[PDB]
Every structure is written in C-alpha cells, then in structure tokens.
Amino acid sequence: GEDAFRKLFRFYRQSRPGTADLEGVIDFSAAHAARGKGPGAQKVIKSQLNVSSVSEQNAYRAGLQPVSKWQAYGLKGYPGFIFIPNPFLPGYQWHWVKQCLKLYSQKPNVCNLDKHMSKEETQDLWEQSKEFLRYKPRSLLEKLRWVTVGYHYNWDSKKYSADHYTPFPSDLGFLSEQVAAACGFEDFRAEAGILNYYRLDSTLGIHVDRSELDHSKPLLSFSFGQSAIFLLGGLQRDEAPTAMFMHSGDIMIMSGFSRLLNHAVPRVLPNPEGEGLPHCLEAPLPAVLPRDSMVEPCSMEDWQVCASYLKTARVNMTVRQVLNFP
Ligand SMILES: O=C(O)c1cnn(-c2ncc(OCc3cccc(OC(F)(F)F)c3)cn2)c1
Ligand SMILES: [Mn+2]
Numbered sequence: 001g002e003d004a005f006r007k008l009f010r011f012y013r014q015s016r017p018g019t020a021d022l023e024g025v026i027d028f029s030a031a032h033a034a035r036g037k038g039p040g041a042q043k044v045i046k047s048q049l050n051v052s053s054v055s056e057q058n059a060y061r062a063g064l065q066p067v068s069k070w071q072a073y074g075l076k077g078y079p080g081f082i083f084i085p086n087p088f089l090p091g092y093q094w095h096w097v098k099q100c101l102k103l104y105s106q107k108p109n110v111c112n113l114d115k116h117m118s119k120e121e122t123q124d125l126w127e128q129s130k131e132f133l134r135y136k137p138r139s140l141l142e143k144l145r146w147v148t149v150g151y152h153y154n155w156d157s158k159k160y161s162a163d164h165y166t167p168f169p170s171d172l173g174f175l176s177e178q179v180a181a182a183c184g185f186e187d188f189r190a191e192a193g194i195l196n197y198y199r200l201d202s203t204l205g206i207h208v209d210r211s212e213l214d215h216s217k218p219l220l221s222f223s224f225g226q227s228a229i230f231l232l233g234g235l236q237r238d239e240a241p242t243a244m245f246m247h248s249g250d251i252m253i254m255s256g257f258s259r260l261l262n263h264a265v266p267r268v269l270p271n272p273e274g275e276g277l278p279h280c281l282e283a284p285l286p287a288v289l290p291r292d293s294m295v296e297p298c299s300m301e302d303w304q305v306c307a308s309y310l311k312t313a314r315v316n317m318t319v320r321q322v323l324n325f326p
Pocket of ligand 1: 073146148149152153194203208209221263264265316318324325326
C-alpha cells in the first residue's frame with residue numbers, strides 16, 4: 001500500500017511461509033522471554049485470569065482445560081486486549097468446527113448465499129457435502145463466507161433485522177461465557193455472533209468493528225483450521241499495527257478501547273505441505289462424552305467433511321454482547 005498499515009498488510013499477504021519474512025510475527029504459543037523479534041515480542045505481557053470465576057465442572061462441560069491451566073497475554077499499549085492460546089481439551093475443536101459448518105449455517109440463521117431474504121435452498125448443504133466426498137463444480141459449503149447468529153443485519157435500514165431474532169446457540173453461548181468470565185466479565189451474555197469462513201487466499205481488509213463506546217461490550221474471537229496472520233493497529237488507520245499469529249483454537253478477547261482499533265487478517269497460512277491439519281487437531285473428539293456436557297458426539301461422516309474442509313480453510317467465530325457495528 002502507501003501508509004504503514006497498508007504496507008504491512010500487503011507485506012504479509014505476499015509473504016513466504018517458512019522464511020524469515022515472519023520473524024516479526026508474535027507467536028503467543030512459543031516459549032520465550034519476549035525476545036527474538038524486536039519490537040513485537042517485547043510488548044508481550046502476562047495477563048491475569050479470574051481463575052476462581054470458572055469452575056472445573058464448567059470448563060470441562062465447555063470442552064476447555066481448567067482455567068488454571070490457561071495462559072493469557074496482553075500487549076503493551078493495547079488496553080482491553082487479551083490473547084489466549086488454545087485452551088481447548090484435545091479433540092474438542094472438532095465439535096465447534098462441526099457446529100459452524102453443519103448446524104449454525106442452517107437456514108434459520110442468515111448467511112452470505114443470500115442478502116437477508118431467501119434464495120431457493122435446493123439440496124441441503126451438509127448432505128451434498130457428504131456426497132461430494134463419496135463420488136469422484138463449487139461446493140455449496142465451499143461458497144459459504146459468513147453467517148450471523150442471534151442478530152441479523154438487514155442492509156437497507158443499516159441496522160439489525162426488525163422481526164428476525166433467532167435464539168443464540170446455547171453450546172456456543174456457554175463456551176463464550178466461560179471464557180469471558182475468566183477474563184473478568186462474569187456477567188457477559190452472548191447475543192450476537194458472526195461466523196467467517198476463509199479459504200487459503202481469503203483476506204479481511206483493514207477495518208474497525210464499531211465506532212462508539214457507551215454501548216460497547218466485550219467481543220470474543222475464536223479461530224480453527226489453518227493459522228492466520230492478525231494485524232492489530234490503532235484508532236487511526238495509518239498507525240503501524242502489531243502482527244501476531246492466530247493458530248487453531250486460539251482466542252482473542254477485545255474489550256474497552258481495544259474494541260475500537262483497526263484490525264485485519266492479511267494472510268491465512270497454508271499447511272506447510274500445502275494441504276493438511278494443524279497438530280492440535282490430530283486428536284479426535286472422544287467417543288464417549290460426559291453426559292452433563294454441552295458438547296455432543298461427532299459422527300465419522302461428519303468428521304470426514306470437517307477434516308477435508310479444514311485442510312485448506314480457517315473458521316472464525318466472533319461472539320459479542322449487544323445490550324451497532326459497521
Ligand atoms: O477472522 C477474524 O479474525 C476476524 C477479525 N475480525 N473479523 C470481523 N470483524 C468484524 C466483522 O464485522 C461483521 C459485521 C458488522 C456489522 C454487521 C454485520 O452483518 C453482516 F452480516 F455483515 F451483514 C457484520 C466481521 N469479521 C473477523
Ligand atoms: Mn473485526
């Protein structure tokens with residue numbers, strides 16, 4: 001580009017994995033004393049979690065490790081910003097990817113394959129995808145770009161849909177509220193969410209989520225599949241951002257003034273052998289889940305679709321409290 005955020009976004013978009021092009025990116029999943037990079041790594045600080053605020057039972061029920069096993073970080077100069085590397089129990093990411101791909105995209109919610117009205121939804125998305133695999137044209141699941149849950153934009157009023165509120169998925173609600181509680185938002189309520197589905201060449205340009213405090217509540221950002229490069233900038237659009245990786249299962253929480261910062265995803269990184277899954281996903285969802293659990297079993301035919309999809313995709317979930325938002 002021409003200004004410093006656009007320069008870095010283009011840099012990272014055109015960057016070569018596996019070379020020193022990325023030695024400037026923070027990896028919160030690396031074991032260091034905030035070194036090795038220059039300016040980025042030096043900003044990394046521990047952030048304290050409200051460990052007593054999420055019981056063991058409730059973490060487990062959510063598919064999470066016990067909050068006391070979590071690590072969490074901020075960045076000097078970015079108030080309200082918390083980064084938590086994958087706190088999910090092994091296998092449990094598969095549940096949330098399944099829900100995003102198969103259930104949440106189901107028609108009561110709104111997706112990009114129409115604006116807000118309905119197009120003729122011929123041939124259920126999931127069961128086509130199931131039989132695109134069995135038999136050797138662009139999949140209906142491969143075309144999905146975003147999905148709104150809870151609150152849905154109308155695009156003419158430029159505000160949320162009048163008479164179309166859909167109930168917020170209570171498993172994703174429980175998970176979000178456990179994380180938000182441990183970040184010290186024990187009253188948080190999940191009410192509006194967006195699911196973003198990226199291919200390996202998909203990007204997200206420089207943007208802010210909202211422009212107003214006085215109604216701003218915390219926003220949580222989940223990630224699954226391939227890693228992305230995340231750029232976190234400032235209130236004005238040409239302040240140079242800080243680059244960081246989002247690996248499968250990482251969670252970012254934005255509150256306070258962080259909620260207003262310009263951010264971006266310039267790059268979804270391919271698996272280093274071009275097609276394949278991150279290591280944390282090499283664990284399957286247990287066969288026997290706890291009876292009191294908010295997660296449900298996953299079927300082989302469902303897993304196969306997810307496993308094939310994610311080889312070249314990143315799934316993003318953002319969840320926020322409402323009581324809006326370019
Ligand atoms: O993948 C990541 O890491 C990432 C980081 N940010 N991000 C992101 N941020 C904002 C955002 O705005 C959604 C938005 C706003 C208003 C109305 C909307 O309704 C409609 F459905 F679009 F019509 C939607 C989407 N995605 C994703
Ligand atoms: Mn955003």
